[PDB]
Design a protein around this ligand. Sequence first.
Ligand SMILES: Cc1nc2c3c(ccn2c1C)[C@@H](O)[C@H](O)[C@H](c1ccccc1)N3
Ligand SMILES: *[C@@H]1O[C@H](CO)[C@@H](O)[C@H](O)[C@H]1NC(C)=O
Ligand SMILES: *[C@@H]1O[C@H](CO)[C@@H](O)[C@H](O)[C@H]1NC(C)=O
Ligand SMILES: *[C@@H]1O[C@H](CO)[C@@H](O)[C@H](O)[C@H]1NC(C)=O
Ligand SMILES: [Mg+2]
Ligand SMILES: [Rb+]
Ligand SMILES: [Rb+]
Ligand SMILES: [Rb+]
Ligand SMILES: [Rb+]
Lengths: 261, 985
Amino acid sequence: LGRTLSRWVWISLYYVAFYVVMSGIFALCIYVLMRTIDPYTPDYQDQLKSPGVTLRPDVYGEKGLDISYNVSDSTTWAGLAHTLHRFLAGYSPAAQEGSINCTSEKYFFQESFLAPNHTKFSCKFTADMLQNCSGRPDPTFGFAEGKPCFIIKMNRIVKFLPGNSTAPRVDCAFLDQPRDGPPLQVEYFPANGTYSLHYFPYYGKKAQPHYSNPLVAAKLLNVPRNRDVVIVCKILAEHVSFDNPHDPYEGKVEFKLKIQK
Amino acid sequence: EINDHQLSVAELEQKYQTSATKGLSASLAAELLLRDGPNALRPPRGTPEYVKFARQLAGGLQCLMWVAAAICLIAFAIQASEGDLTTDDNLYLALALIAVVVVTGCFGYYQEFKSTNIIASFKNLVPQQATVIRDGDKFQINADQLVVGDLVEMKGGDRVPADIRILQAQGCKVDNSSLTGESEPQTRSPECTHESPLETRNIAFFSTMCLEGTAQGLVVNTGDRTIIGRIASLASGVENEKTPIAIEIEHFVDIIAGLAILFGATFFIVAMCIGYTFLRAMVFFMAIVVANVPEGLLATVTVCLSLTAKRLASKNCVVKNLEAVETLGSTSVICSDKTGTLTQNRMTVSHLWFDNHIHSADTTEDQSGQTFDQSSETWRALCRVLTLCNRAAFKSGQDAVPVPKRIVIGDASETALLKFSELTLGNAMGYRERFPKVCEIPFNSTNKFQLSIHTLEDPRDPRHVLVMKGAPERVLERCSSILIKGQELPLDEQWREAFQTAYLSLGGLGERVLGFCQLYLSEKDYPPGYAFDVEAMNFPTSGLCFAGLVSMIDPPRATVPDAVLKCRTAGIRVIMVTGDHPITAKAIAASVGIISEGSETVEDIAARLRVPVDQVNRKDARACVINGMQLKDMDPSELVEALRTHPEMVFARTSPQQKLVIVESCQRLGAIVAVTGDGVNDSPALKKADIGVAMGIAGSDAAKNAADMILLDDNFASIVTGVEQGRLIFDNLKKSIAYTLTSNIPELTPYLIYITVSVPLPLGCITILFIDLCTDIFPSVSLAYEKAESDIMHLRPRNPKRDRLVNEPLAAYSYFQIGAIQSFAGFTDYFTAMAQEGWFPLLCVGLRPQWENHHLQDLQDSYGQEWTFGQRLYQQYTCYTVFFISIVMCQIADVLIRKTRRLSAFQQGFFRNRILVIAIVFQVCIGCFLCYCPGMPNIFNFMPIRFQWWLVPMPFSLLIFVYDEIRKLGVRCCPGSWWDQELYY
Ligand SMILES: Cc1nc2c3c(ccn2c1C)[C@@H](O)[C@H](O)[C@H](c1ccccc1)N3
Ligand SMILES: *[C@@H]1O[C@H](CO)[C@@H](O)[C@H](O)[C@H]1NC(C)=O
Ligand SMILES: *[C@@H]1O[C@H](CO)[C@@H](O)[C@H](O)[C@H]1NC(C)=O
Ligand SMILES: *[C@@H]1O[C@H](CO)[C@@H](O)[C@H](O)[C@H]1NC(C)=O
Ligand SMILES: [Mg+2]
Ligand SMILES: [Rb+]
Ligand SMILES: [Rb+]
Ligand SMILES: [Rb+]
Ligand SMILES: [Rb+]
């Protein structure tokens, strides 16, 4: 407004002073905040009540996962298979090297940090456990024979226990297909679909830098050809719930599949 | 109009095909009725109610709320090309904008309907009639049936039916107090006095009242062609100006709009630099310009203006527009009509002369003033001569209406005497019916006296009272003794001369002096049963005994003399605009206070100094009386110089249009003018004024329809309420708007940062809507229930060009200081709530792409935990619900700090404003219900929130209290230039 050039400087200095005063208050507030935060354990973790279930290959055209392909055209499933492979490039024998061979089936509870630089020990998972649904001996993960291999992973919540009685198991089945068409026949690798109970509790990336989630794979044998089907993969465990209507990805993953020959 | 009173009866009765003796024909009079229409003023021909609500939808704030809604809908197209999600937020925001404008308009329409109906609950729907001579027969018809050229008979107490030319008349006197301001009853004769029909005597006017006499005339004009009609229709041509509050709201919507354009342009340029596409950067520009718009400020302003109209209604003052509630506090000049508005327009007895003393009476209606000596022997005789010699009588069943307001059947002179006897004595008619009337001679020019011979109460006195009244010099030529101090002394040259010095003193004040004389008749010369005669006088028409003098005038109204004083002590300049002759104007200007005591005109200095008025320098005079004849000879420059040079002004013999010129000149010079009025002579100049006040009982329908304020009780004291309340709201709206304005930046900066740092969205639209249209209405409306921060009624009138409702200091403070603190509180609570649930501040930077991606159901946090879209959507809703409470808890401080602008809260009192504290409680209660009611997580975007984050912003709230208290003590303790120029709102 040019009321007075000389007075402009004094009120400009007042405004910069006000802002830096409140900025210092704000900076002190964020630093006292961060000093109140434990780095291995979430302070509240309110919304992480029950876990999410995620699927590979992940292809959403619209309105959810829609994986449609033609077995006689390599271009329709090469991307699917490559996403699987580049996903499992960190589930590689010599890339999971930072963890330890885990033979304790019931649990892996660790109260003290016993790894370099005050880190903890982590459990191991290589691609071998997915015996058929691996690059060995099929680099197509079952997609070239109309028996696709879909790999199911559970989301990690710090010090979350899914139930000690048995291990969480993925039952993948047809959704609203009670017709003369037969149930979805699935061969799961690891067998019986069990996520081993020694990959719980997760203690945080700072505590377990090399931790990698367990995986299960479903070889979908019975899937009919040239038919759009829908499949729901539900994880059955005590602390896992699949009835959430505001999170369709809670303890379950649903996908549309069309194998065209 | 000029060539209708100048004609001869021969030419008139050919013009209108009528006769001065036989009247119109039943046939032609029913033809002219269908040609010229009814003899009624034409009501406004247009009143569509849909175009009545449409006008309520239009305003400056409404225009901004309209253009911003259009911007929102255009955004819902730019964001529909590129298909986006949760986009229905724009639809809610725009619909809420339009909804606010609609419902506030509905409120305004309803509260104007209420006012109009109340103003019509006092109006007279009784048909006014006339006596018509048609085909030679006198019958009574409705005035709307009269046609041009009809023979009309007028009687005392009859409203004149049309615009009439007097063909014959016997002592006819009419009250042209609507057309002119002539308080003094005006005589109508069948002969041409002037040619301007306003000052000639052969013409009677449409809505004038025949005070006394009898007349017969020819209707020369009916309808909107009467003087009434053309003045009221000229009042249609003049166009009302914008109310001052409207201009200030428009300047406010200039400020917020310019700020919005600057903000949006800055961040549009910045967004293009960051790397956003032109289309999406422009959507964000639109978002900024909408964020500056206040959703609910129109609602709170309307509610405040309604709450200060309810008060004024309870003080018997009704406003038509809600905008009038402020307009009297910005007023600098008040223009007032002398008759009716300032006076009572009722001849009452003012003074008396008996026992060689000029007694003065109570001229008021409340009878507040002091009456006179009512114990002398002379007074009882005077109160008998004035009581008995009065052929007038009150109408029936008025024994509950106050004596002044009662309707009397009698002359202008006799009505005041009857009301005087009623107030001073009581039961005047019953007292008069204790002394029969043997003989009377009321109205003859040869005798010039009302004679009445009565018989005394007691039969102990067969003596006969002879009471007669008339012009004092017609009385004294017939009296021989004077009643003084319990004696009948003779009329020396001294007593005659003192009577003359009283007649010429009580008649120099502009009063109707009347003299009363009496005599007691013998029981022997005139035994009970004497047969009196008039042709051959057999009673004494001479040798009477003088009783006293009684003088009547048009008195000032009760509360006026103090009302103009309390107005003037507020810096308001009171000017008078009357059509009455100058002497009456000066008298009722000195009495009421427009002309200060000890102030003299240039014509008075020329009598003090006995100098020609030319040599008397004008600047040495602080008062002036300017006639219409010399206001028509005066150019604009002369008016401006004469107006400022003489501070106290009285305008005399003005016309409808000359008043309009005065108001126009004062407004052009930079004043907010207010016109107080009654009668059709003020309907022109009541429209152009910024506020037009009309007397609700004594005012004509034209001045009550072309007004903005109606005083139902005719209490001129309501004006001195309308200022102070009107002032308060200004100062109490400057506060309210300020508070609401602060909410823009603590709402904008989230979004401004949600794009600038790409943090997850802190605050959503469904929540800023709840902030603006639910939580911040009760506080701001409460801010108007506050009390004065000074002697508001002694402060000089606010300067239009310097002192404004919203100025740059106010908006700059409310945004950049206070709302910045609020934004910091929100950011602290945002980073805190996120870090407690797994998202550290550094990770929040740049996370919005993956936060809002519908395809990532395994996003990993700072602790390494993996979240789906729904889980972190609920957590985003938590950021919403904590920024919400951050703002509301940081504004519980705002309402308190803005309850005062100079004084501290301790001095005024924290809890002194009750509605403020009720609103604070309601704010927190609505917050708790919204967060912890089952289902609000998905009905709206509010969820149960931990009780640690309620208290993170409280330090900030106390910082607000501390900061405003220090910056308010800075102005009060040190009224220095620095703080007041830079840090005072
Ligand atoms: C002050 C503010 N405005 C918004 C806002 C959104 C979210 C948070 N917002 C905040 C905190 C979105 O729903 C939209 O971009 C919306 C919008 C879009 C275009 C034009 C006008 C408004 N504006
Ligand atoms: C499993 O444990 C064996 C020892 O039994 C050790 O070689 C290694 O940790 C794991 N096996 C392989 C092949 O790496
Ligand atoms: C899995 O692989 C083994 C050997 O590689 C084979 O015998 C078996 O049939 C395979 N299962 C399916 C379902 O193809
Ligand atoms: C699958 O691919 C082959 C060759 O690419 C094509 O001939 C065939 O029609 C495809 N199947 C369908 C159902 O279109
Ligand atoms: Mg009047
Ligand atoms: Rb970017
Ligand atoms: Rb806003
Ligand atoms: Rb008196
Ligand atoms: Rb007006």
